[PDB]
Amino acid sequence: SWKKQAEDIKKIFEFKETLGTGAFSEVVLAEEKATGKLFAVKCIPKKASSIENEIAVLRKIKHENIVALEDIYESPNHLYLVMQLVSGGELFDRIVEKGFYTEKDASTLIRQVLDAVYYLHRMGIVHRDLKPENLLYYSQDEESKIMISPGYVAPEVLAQKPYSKAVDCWSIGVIAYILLCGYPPFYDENDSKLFEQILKAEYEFDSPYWDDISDSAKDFIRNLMEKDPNKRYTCEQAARHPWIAGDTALNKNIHESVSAQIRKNFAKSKWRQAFNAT
Amino acid sequence: SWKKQAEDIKKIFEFKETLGTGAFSEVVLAEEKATGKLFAVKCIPKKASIENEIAVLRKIKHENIVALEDIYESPNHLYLVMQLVSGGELFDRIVEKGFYTEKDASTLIRQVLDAVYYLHRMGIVHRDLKPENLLYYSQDEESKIMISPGYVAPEVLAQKPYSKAVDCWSIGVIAYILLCGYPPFYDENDSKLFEQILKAEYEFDSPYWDDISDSAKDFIRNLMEKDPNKRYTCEQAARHPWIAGDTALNKNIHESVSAQIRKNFAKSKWRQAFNAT
Ligand SMILES: Cc1cc(Nc2nc(-c3ccccc3)nc3ccccc23)n[nH]1
Ligand SMILES: Cc1cc(Nc2nc(-c3ccccc3)nc3ccccc23)n[nH]1
């Protein structure tokens, strides 16, 4: 509930192009006039507490693999979230264009996510919405770090039970699954059928897509995609797993099958459609 | 109307001692924890316009005006973070000085002219300039001075609309006090005082003004002019020879001025606020 008097955000930042536009908000590229440094600024009309309490928590979050919230401004009519600019694109586009892709690349990505999420957990924060579409590269560099910016929901949430930090560990297992075959472990006929399958937590390592994948990777995922949240790995536990901390992650090229599956399964991007706008 | 999410002011500053307590507020010495820099923080409960006024203040940036660095708000309080000045009150310095001249008074009025001229360019009328709110930045002997009823201009009493001219009158009044140690208008019965102020009837009384230059008296006459349309602006006052030239005398007048200060300004509102409860 603490504030200070600021100037007009238009006097502090030069608003350049719109990056994307949503149902209720808009994200603009903004240059800080004093420094020339660039930020992505989310502009939210107030006409759209709770959000005031939520956004204060985000301000506290400082981690190398999480997009930083650098400031929140307020006018009578709007909120402005000054966010760290990342310019490396979406995870799925990178993998598809990559040329070579292996278990070590997947494990390198999952290791950074576990670090980010384990930091949130220590800080007392459950993300609740972890999914590969909101994983963005920091920069266009080949070796760039990854940044955190219905089929993914944990069984205990479907089962109307109170959520915990375990919910996020489930989501990390689903992300690990997709990073190694390019499709989701649970997919609908009806949302009815999908719900019942997540509740039972019945999924496969299906042939042929999973035949080249190590037992170690599969073990890793079974410990995160565990139905019972009390049996499921924490982030700290998962980060000690040999697939992450050891040398069991294979270095075979699986790009061909993974890329084809992503093309089929992740052919629509909400970033792209926010850009396509109004 | 523009604000940023901030942290608890007490997480950014260590609040040390209370410097003073008023009817409605408290000033507390505070150390910025990241820097070790000291500020004077005015804490005002919301349980007692002011939004608009505070905004203007944050824009005021001049070396001879106490700066407003930041304003914090909690659900119940406003916290004005102010530049700390530590040289004490003008009147106390003069009284303890040992030696005091027209050159000293003129140096002091030159600074105030520069500060008030800046306020005027920025579109701001002070409206309450008085020597009791002039404080020294530091204890150094050559410290700059800082801006932090018998002083009010004739047109204000004449129930006319105030302009910037009002501050220039106040500078004349300050210049007068600085050269003799007593106010140009005083009467036990303020029916008579009102009439003297309305008519701008004051003296250069003897013997106190005997050793003062005709140049000083001429400068005050142009500032303490009854008609705001005939009265000097700060820009014009600053170009007067007593300010910009060398008509300011180098004769010690501390004896008479200090005696008069001791008689006329024995009470301090800063000391009263300190004394507290
Ligand atoms: C949360 C966030 C997003 C960004 N960057 C970003 N974000 C978007 C973006 C696209 C669609 C909706 C919202 C944001 N587009 C971009 C294009 C080119 C470079 C960066 C970029 N930085 N931080
Ligand atoms: C507006 C302002 C006041 C001050 N300083 C200050 N202010 C006071 C002060 C005294 C009484 C009421 C309000 C403030 N007392 C002080 C004592 C010793 C050093 C500095 C000091 N700095 N900025």
UniProtKB/Swiss-Prot annotation, chain B:
GO BP terms, alphabetized: inflammatory response; negative regulation of apoptotic process; nervous system development; positive regulation of apoptotic process; positive regulation of CREB transcription factor activity; positive regulation of neuron projection development; positive regulation of neutrophil chemotaxis; positive regulation of phagocytosis
GO molecular function list: ATP binding; calcium/calmodulin-dependent protein kinase activity; calmodulin binding; protein serine kinase activity
Expression (tissue specificity): Widely expressed. Highly and mostly expressed in polymorphonuclear leukocytes (neutrophilic and eosinophilic granulocytes) while little or no expression is observed in monocytes and lymphocytes.
Positions where Phosphoserine occurs in the chain: S106
Location of cross-link Glycyl lysine isopeptide (Lys-Gly) (interchain with G-Cter in SUMO2): K97
Regulation: Activated by Ca(2+)/calmodulin. Unlike CaMK4, may be unable to exhibit autonomous activity after Ca(2+)/calmodulin activation.
Domain spans labelled Protein kinase: 13-243
Segments of this protein annotated with the region Calmodulin-binding: 263-277
Keywords of this entry: Allosteric enzyme, ATP-binding, Calcium, Calmodulin-binding, Cytoplasm, Inflammatory response, Isopeptide bond, Kinase, Neurogenesis, Nucleotide-binding, Nucleus, Phosphoprotein, Serine/threonine-protein kinase, Transferase, Ubl conjugation
Active site, per annotation: D128 (proton acceptor)
Swiss-Prot/TrEMBL induction comment: Expression increases upon treatment of EC cells with DMSO and retinoic acid. Induced by KCL in PC12 cells.
Substrates-to-products reaction catalysed: L-seryl-[protein] + ATP = O-phospho-L-seryl-[protein] + ADP + H(+); L-threonyl-[protein] + ATP = O-phospho-L-threonyl-[protein] + ADP + H(+)
Record's comment describing the protein's domains: The autoinhibitory domain overlaps with the calmodulin binding region and interacts in the inactive folded state with the catalytic domain as a pseudosubstrate.
Biological role: Calcium/calmodulin-dependent protein kinase that operates in the calcium-triggered CaMKK-CaMK1 signaling cascade and, upon calcium influx, activates CREB-dependent gene transcription, regulates calcium-mediated granulocyte function and respiratory burst and promotes basal dendritic growth of hippocampal neurons. In neutrophil cells, required for cytokine-induced proliferative responses and activation of the respiratory burst. Activates the transcription factor CREB1 in hippocampal neuron nuclei. May play a role in apoptosis of erythroleukemia cells.
Family assignment from sequence similarity: Belongs to the protein kinase superfamily. CAMK Ser/Thr protein kinase family. CaMK subfamily.
Listed name of the protein: Calcium/calmodulin-dependent protein kinase type 1D
